[PDB]
């Protein structure tokens, strides 16, 4: 009882409305070769999308799970097997993403940049 902690990690995020537009990015992922890295730092610097705020992950025909990881945060949003969904993410000005799965697959993925509340199409 009452064990204090030593180290936490404070970090800034994207949570407001862009003065550009609502802009999403289709980045269909090919796995069964490795883990997949997505780097959108080039788009942030060259005048495009300001920061990923929501994910749309579409796993309808896939048999396993899909994990997306932010490296500045360590958040590990894991979409489930036969479900589609909107997921708000904690992501920084670094838009780097580590996409993984279990075995195989092709996944439509949308890096949304505007807030959409969470939902998952089948539940259970």
């Amino acid at each position: 009882m009452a064990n204090q902690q030593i180290g936490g990690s404070t970090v800034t995020y994207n949570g407001a409305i862009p003065m550009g537009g609502p802009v999403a990015i289709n980045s269909v992922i090919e796995i069964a070769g490795t883990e997949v890295l997505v780097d959108l730092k080039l788009d942030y610097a060259t005048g495009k999308i300001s920061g990923v705020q929501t994910l749309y992950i579409d796993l309808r025909d896939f048999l396993g799970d899909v994990t997306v990881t932010m490296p500045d945060t360590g958040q590990r949003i894991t979409a489930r097997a036969g479900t589609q969904g909107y997921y708000p993410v904690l992501s920084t000005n670094l838009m780097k993403f580590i996409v993984s799965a279990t075995i195989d697959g092709k996944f439509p993925m949308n890096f949304i940049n505007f807030p959409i509340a969470l939902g998952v199409w089948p539940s259970g």
């Binding site: 404070t10 970090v11 800034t12 070769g33 780097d39 080039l42 060259t46 500045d72 000005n93």
Partner: protein, 374 residues
């Protein structure tokens, strides 16, 4: 234009105040944190610096105690070596603004590029007085045999100001509710030991016995260099105002989609004034000394090239800057005499025309640039 005289009169008042701070204040370097950990538990740590004076950089000392637990086989050091001990460094301003978000091997190469020599290395001389490798400031064994234990050490300079005499990019950390921050990620047991046939890019050791290599400890120590005892006047502090308004940043990236004998252009961002460029042609877990690149260039917006050179002639330009060659696959482009602003002269890009492209081949791009609100 009448507006180009006030922005040169504001530079004259700024440079008058820079030479007041650098001449009438005290350079301090003090230890802010030290910690020893096991990387199986955690490897990402946050360092709270001291909020005093004008901060102009951090010196990070990382040690390690890698042990090879294999039965009969050994591992050997990679080309990047102990520079992959810090996987990432992120710095945050007192106003929580991100300055530098590069990796470890790129931070070492800008440290090499800003010195004119490999960073904190001792050059071999003919002298009979015993100079040389005495203290082992940067040190790692070449091989670690089965059952052995190698001691590593490595130093990083995380810059805020551009140099010691040029206070551009420096941070004034005398603010009340300061959010100054220095993130650090370190190599755990999954990113530092690669098997044979793997990608030795972020690894430290590689060999037939990397499946049983592990860390015993990683210790880090952070030192903050800053300027204390700032000149105070009647109206307050005397400061180089548009020197502390400018950032000096270090970023890295990773591009893909390389095709043989096709130019691959990476565009420069229009808001930055780029000072250097580092391109690492990672040809699918294989690194080559220029024998897989036709040419490298810096092409402008129309189609005009400015330095379209063979990979041996590209290396000849870096040998009159850092007096040696970067490791194989690493290519450096210097623009310090005239920075790539790419807002006052078109849209400049960086071109690599490859000769051979393997599967999962990528191009890592490290940048170094100024940033303000002009």
């Amino acid at each position: 234009q009448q507006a180009a005289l006030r922005n040169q009169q504001a530079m004259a008042a700024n440079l008058q105040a820079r030479q007041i701070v650098l001449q009438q204040s005290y350079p301090v370097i003090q230890q802010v944190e030290t910690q020893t950990f096991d990387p199986a538990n955690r490897s990402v740590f946050d360092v709270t610096p001291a909020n005093v004076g004008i901060v102009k950089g951090f010196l990070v000392k990382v040690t390690a105690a890698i042990k090879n637990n294999h039965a009969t086989e050994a591992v050997a050091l990679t080309d990047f070596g102990p520079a992959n001990l810090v996987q990432r460094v992120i710095y945050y301003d007192p106003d929580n603004q991100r300055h530098t978000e590069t990796s470890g091997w790129h931070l070492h190469f800008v440290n090499t590029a800003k010195q004119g020599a490999p960073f904190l290395s001792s050059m071999v001389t003919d002298s009979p007085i015993k100079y040389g490798d005495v203290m082992n400031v940067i040190d790692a064994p070449a091989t670690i045999a089965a059952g052995a234990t190698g001691e590593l050490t490595m130093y990083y300079w995380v810059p805020l100001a551009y140099s010691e005499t040029d206070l551009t990019g420096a941070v004034l950390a005398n603010v009340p509710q300061s959010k100054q921050r220095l993130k650090l990620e370190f190599a755990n047991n999954n990113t530092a030991f690669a098997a044979v046939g793997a990608n030795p890019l972020e690894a430290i050791y590689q060999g037939a016995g990397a499946a049983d290599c592990e860390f015993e400890e990683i210790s880090y120590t952070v030192y903050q260099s800053y300027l204390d005892q700032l000149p105070v006047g009647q109206n307050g502090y005397i400061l180089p105002l548009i020197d502390l308004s400018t950032l000096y940043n270090l970023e890295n990236s990773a591009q893909a989609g390389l095709t043989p004998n096709v130019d691959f252009v990476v565009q420069y961002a229009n808001l930055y004034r780029y000072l250097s460029t580092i391109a690492v042609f990672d040809n699918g877990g294989s690194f080559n000394a220029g024998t897989d690149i036709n040419y490298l260039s810096q092409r402008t917006a129309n189609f005009s090239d400015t330095r379209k050179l063979d990979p041996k002639t590209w290396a000849a330009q870096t040998r009159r800057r850092i007096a040696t060659d970067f490791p194989k696959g690493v290519y450096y482009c210097d623009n310090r005499d005239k920075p790539i602003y790419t807002l006052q002269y078109g849209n400049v890009g960086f071109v690599v025309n490859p000769k051979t492209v393997n599967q999962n081949a990528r191009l890592l791009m490290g940048y170094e640039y100024f940033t303000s609100r002009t």
